[PDB]
Design a protein around this nucleic acid. Sequence first.
RNA 1: AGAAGACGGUCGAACUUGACUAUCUAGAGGAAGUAAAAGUCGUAACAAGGUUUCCGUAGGUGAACCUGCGGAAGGAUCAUUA
RNA 2: GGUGACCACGGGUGACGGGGAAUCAGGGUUCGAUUCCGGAGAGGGAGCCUGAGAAACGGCUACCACAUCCAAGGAAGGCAGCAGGCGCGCAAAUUACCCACUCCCGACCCGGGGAGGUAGUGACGAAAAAUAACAAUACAGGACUCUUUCGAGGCCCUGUAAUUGGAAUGAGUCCACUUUAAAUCCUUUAACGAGGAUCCAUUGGAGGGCAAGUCUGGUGCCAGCAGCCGCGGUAAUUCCAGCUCCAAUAGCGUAUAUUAAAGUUGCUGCAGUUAAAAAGCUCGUAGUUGGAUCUUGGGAGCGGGCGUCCCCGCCCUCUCGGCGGGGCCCGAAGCGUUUACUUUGAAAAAAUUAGAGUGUUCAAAGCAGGCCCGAGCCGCCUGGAUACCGCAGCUAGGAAUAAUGGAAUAGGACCGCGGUUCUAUUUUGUUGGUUUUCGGAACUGAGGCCAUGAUUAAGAGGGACGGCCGGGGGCAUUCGUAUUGCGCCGCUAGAGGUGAAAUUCUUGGACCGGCGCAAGACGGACCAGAGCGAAAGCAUUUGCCAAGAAUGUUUUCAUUAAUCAAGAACGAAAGUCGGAGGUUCGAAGACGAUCAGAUACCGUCGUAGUUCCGACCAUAAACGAUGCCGACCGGCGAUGCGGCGGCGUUAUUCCCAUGACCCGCCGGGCAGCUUCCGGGAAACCAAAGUCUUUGGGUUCCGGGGGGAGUAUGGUUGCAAAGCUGAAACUUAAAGGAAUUGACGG
Lengths: 141, 150, 129
Amino acid sequence: GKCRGLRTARKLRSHRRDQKWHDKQYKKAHLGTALKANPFGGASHAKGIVLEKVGVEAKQPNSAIRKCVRVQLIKNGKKITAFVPNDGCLNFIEENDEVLVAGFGRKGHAVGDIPGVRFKVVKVANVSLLALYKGKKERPR
Amino acid sequence: GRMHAPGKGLSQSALPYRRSVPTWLKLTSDDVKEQIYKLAKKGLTPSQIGVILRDSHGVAQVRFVTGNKILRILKSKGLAPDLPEDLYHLIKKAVAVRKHLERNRKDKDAKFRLILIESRIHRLARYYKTKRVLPPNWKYESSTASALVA
Amino acid sequence: VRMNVLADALKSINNAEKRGKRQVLIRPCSKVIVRFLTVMMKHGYIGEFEIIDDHRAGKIVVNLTGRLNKCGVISPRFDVQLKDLEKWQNNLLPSRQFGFIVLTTSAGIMDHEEARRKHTGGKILGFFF
RNA sequence: AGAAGACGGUCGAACUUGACUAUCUAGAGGAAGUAAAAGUCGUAACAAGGUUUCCGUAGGUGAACCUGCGGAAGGAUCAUUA
RNA sequence: GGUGACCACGGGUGACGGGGAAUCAGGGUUCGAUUCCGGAGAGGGAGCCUGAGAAACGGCUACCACAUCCAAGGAAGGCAGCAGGCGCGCAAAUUACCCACUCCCGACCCGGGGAGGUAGUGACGAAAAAUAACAAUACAGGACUCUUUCGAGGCCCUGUAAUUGGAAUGAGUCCACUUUAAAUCCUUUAACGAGGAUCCAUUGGAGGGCAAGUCUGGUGCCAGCAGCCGCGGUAAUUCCAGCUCCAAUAGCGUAUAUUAAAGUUGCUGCAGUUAAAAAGCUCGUAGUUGGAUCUUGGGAGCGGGCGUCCCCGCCCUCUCGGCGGGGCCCGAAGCGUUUACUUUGAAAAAAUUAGAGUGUUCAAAGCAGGCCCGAGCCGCCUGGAUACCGCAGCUAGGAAUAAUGGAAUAGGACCGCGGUUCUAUUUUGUUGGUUUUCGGAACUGAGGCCAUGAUUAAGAGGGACGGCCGGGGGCAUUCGUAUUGCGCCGCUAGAGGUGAAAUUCUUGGACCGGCGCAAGACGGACCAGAGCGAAAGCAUUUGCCAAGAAUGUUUUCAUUAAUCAAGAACGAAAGUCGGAGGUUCGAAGACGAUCAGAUACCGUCGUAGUUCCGACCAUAAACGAUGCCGACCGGCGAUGCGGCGGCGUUAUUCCCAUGACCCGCCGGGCAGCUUCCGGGAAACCAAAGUCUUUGGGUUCCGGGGGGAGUAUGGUUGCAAAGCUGAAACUUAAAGGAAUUGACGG
Ligand SMILES: [Mg+2]
Ligand SMILES: [Mg+2]
Ligand SMILES: [Mg+2]
Ligand SMILES: [Mg+2]
Ligand SMILES: [Mg+2]
Ligand SMILES: [Mg+2]
Ligand SMILES: [Mg+2]
Ligand SMILES: [Mg+2]
Ligand SMILES: [Mg+2]
Ligand SMILES: [Mg+2]
Ligand SMILES: [Mg+2]
Ligand SMILES: [Mg+2]
Ligand SMILES: [Mg+2]
Ligand SMILES: [Mg+2]
Ligand SMILES: [Mg+2]
Ligand SMILES: [Mg+2]
Ligand SMILES: [Mg+2]
Ligand SMILES: [Mg+2]
Ligand SMILES: [Mg+2]
Ligand SMILES: [Mg+2]
Ligand SMILES: [Mg+2]
């Protein structure tokens, strides 16, 4: 049972902040280990340079080659993997391009059948990937 | 429940609602008083003064007959022990256990019981200190306990 | 050990009432218990009750009328002012039509309707509806 | 009236060494844990899983594991007769 | 000496503080660099001059770091001011005009102000609001109607394509006016300005969640989609497209932080048998929480109507009462405790929040504004509220709940009378002297009176007392057969062991039988859903030593209590060290079996150990996988202890007790059966009940699964290891209980 005394507010408050460390969301948002380990450093988007184009096998029930790129970030120089999310947008990418990279959608957790890819490409060579996919504007040739 | 036992007994006296003295009790107030004086001078604690008085002489309650408690009467005259009786028997019990432990140091049970008894001594002594029955520096020591008792 | 005689009285009343018994006996009697029973009986949620006098803390025999849903207690007697008595009414009472919160004020132990009427707060004791 | 300048004192930047304290980071090599899977070896747990299982402890073995001592039933017995 | 478990000190902060912002049952959770108030700084420190005010930086001096020009002798720096750059980045504007407004500075009606104002960039965000309306034809639809389906029109709304078909307007061009310091924009208003009104609405979707297609073509586990389930291997409602629909709309999608959702942090308000979880057990200081009890009842007209409703008056004392001697009156002093609590008042910046008023053309806003002018109106009427502002502090009421006190060896209260040191003042007005006991305050002895003064004794606790009770503990003592070995005796070739064997022992007399001895273990059957103990655990007899529960009690104290951080005692087995002893059993090890292999299960030996003493260790499925104290809520039959009653049978004797049974009752226990008390996911539980009708007190402790009880730090240990104890990363399930099936050596 929990103490209900009129002068137990110190124990109630101390027990709350002690027990708050036992759930994942509070622990990761206040310890700072997750912030340090995040390649984006708490940023929604981050720019990088395409090191190479890579293909990743899907998980066990599915069977496909997801098109990704290894990209090192222009800040802090960390190498990550970013998905290229359309039917043929890997053709738009090429070696040594500046790409805007966003999270994939569930906060540092891998999405779908792609194993260990937390990021996706939003813009490449300063032009939007959706714009290139829909032919609204072209790569600067 | 018992303080230092897992027992939940109910054995205790049940005082009657009729506080009036029985009509057959011919002993008067000072008569009960002087009988208490004789028994205390024989070397009796108030608890066993009340036992013999209730039993042989048929007094229901000393407090009812004389208007005051036995220890209140003894302390008013000035022949009541300074060490309270419930405390005195606690040191005496601890002294006996400690004496027994010296011959038998493999009696882990008696070491356990000694801790309980000493705890009861220290809790009771703390209570008497706050009621000023005991001196503020009255310290129960395991070494000088034997001289403090008897 | 027993640290709230009013809590034990109210829980005993609740259990006998749920059981459907015509009478209930409360072993420790107190002034607070008697006042609480008086405000319940005046509103009609219980019947007549007797205070059995032994020279100790007496007992009480309460005549249950079978119209008491709940008679709980609030053991930490919080300081309820008038500005936050409405919150306690919403949290405790089953509706705004009936139900009562008993809180001891400096004008005596009384229900919340009377406490609001004479503009006084105090310590919350319990509730019944 | 009076400038430079000098003694002593006091604040005291800055530098050197040393100590303590916070983070960040390199590192031959070592040892893990994850994921992939479709590999080799055996079959330890699941039925009394073919030696019932498991816990603590100690020793041993390619590997799961085996064995000793004490315990538990989450057992395969809620029961075994004057 | 000071401060500390009521958290000092130290460390971190991705901390300037507050007014406030977001979310919005209530309670809370995050954010507050940011225009208001306070603080701090001007590349980092430091020291100064002037001045009222500076440790000033658009002041100086020196050092440190950058860095400018040089004729190399020297000199000059501070944009975290407005612009504008570089760098950094996911991330943010014009090297514009002006003191006209708000104010500020100055010797000052006049000058100055990158304060500030205006415009520019501006889908941060917020308010308003176009992309079309109408009419008449055709064809449906409507309770349509007229004969009762059949046909039409005396009616209503949509729809599809049309010379319809002629009305209305902006968005734009663009004159003037207007605003303004000069402009711009807006509002007016000339002239143009709409029939694919081509003057063109988009962003996301259409399996489910979740509104919307079982349409058509392509692809064919590929490409890809897919936040999550999942889709895709040939007629894919999920991909790629076409068409058509759906959602919001000048806005929609995505990423990430945060809030609700989350009763998944739980004070309101979560859980802890089996899902994650109660420490092995007990003591115990902090901490938290604590039985009952002290003024109730009765009154007078005003009175929620004595209108027995009751606004309600309730039927403290002493000092001048400021209306040295008036009743016509109400002020100076203290509380016959201290607090907490509640109500009122004061003081609590503005903005923001709520909220009063106000047609901003509506609204977000803003604090404005309205009335008449008959033209003399030679001007009147307003508003610019109010609420809230925690906690702390101030003031006055109330005294229920809670804490704290008084008089106990009476150095107790009141009322007076004895008993001792100084001091305001007089006027014994010609000074001087004054008596000034003058009035009061100093210490005190003998009294009277106080109803003289202690609430009760908790189905709270402690202690005493009585008889019993118990594999409870320790010490000593006693017995039992068994096992092993040995000594003598008898006959035999086997004995042992296994599923079958084999290793092993055996004419040296094995095994077997007999008489004995020694050793060290172990206390069968009696032995139970029985007892005791805090657990671990405890079983031969007898004695000693202390200890304990329960029952009995008209005994005693009087709240001494419950749970408990820190700390502490005990703690199976195994293990470690030292010394004895080693019967049996037996880790390790060896051999023999078995098997495809067999580092095993089976057999024969056999080390450490198993035994005792001492010293460590502190761990078990240490289990009831189930905290302790307290209250309440069904029934029944037993059982252990104690006590109280009663027909009877039995023990002996001459009667009672007293034992053995028998029938009951009470209390404390170990449990059991049953029950629609109730609970729970159920299994099940009279507790795991009294829980959305949620609060008796109080400890420990859980927060999806793994990583992981791992790494690291600290501490304990001779070691083995124990205690405390993460993170990165990874994953969509892992689990619990029941159900059906299938399977089982
Ligand atoms: Mg090596
Ligand atoms: Mg096994
Ligand atoms: Mg097995
Ligand atoms: Mg800061
Ligand atoms: Mg701020
Ligand atoms: Mg400054
Ligand atoms: Mg000046
Ligand atoms: Mg300065
Ligand atoms: Mg348009
Ligand atoms: Mg489609
Ligand atoms: Mg949320
Ligand atoms: Mg939960
Ligand atoms: Mg579990
Ligand atoms: Mg304590
Ligand atoms: Mg009380
Ligand atoms: Mg043989
Ligand atoms: Mg052991
Ligand atoms: Mg040894
Ligand atoms: Mg052997
Ligand atoms: Mg509690
Ligand atoms: Mg977890």
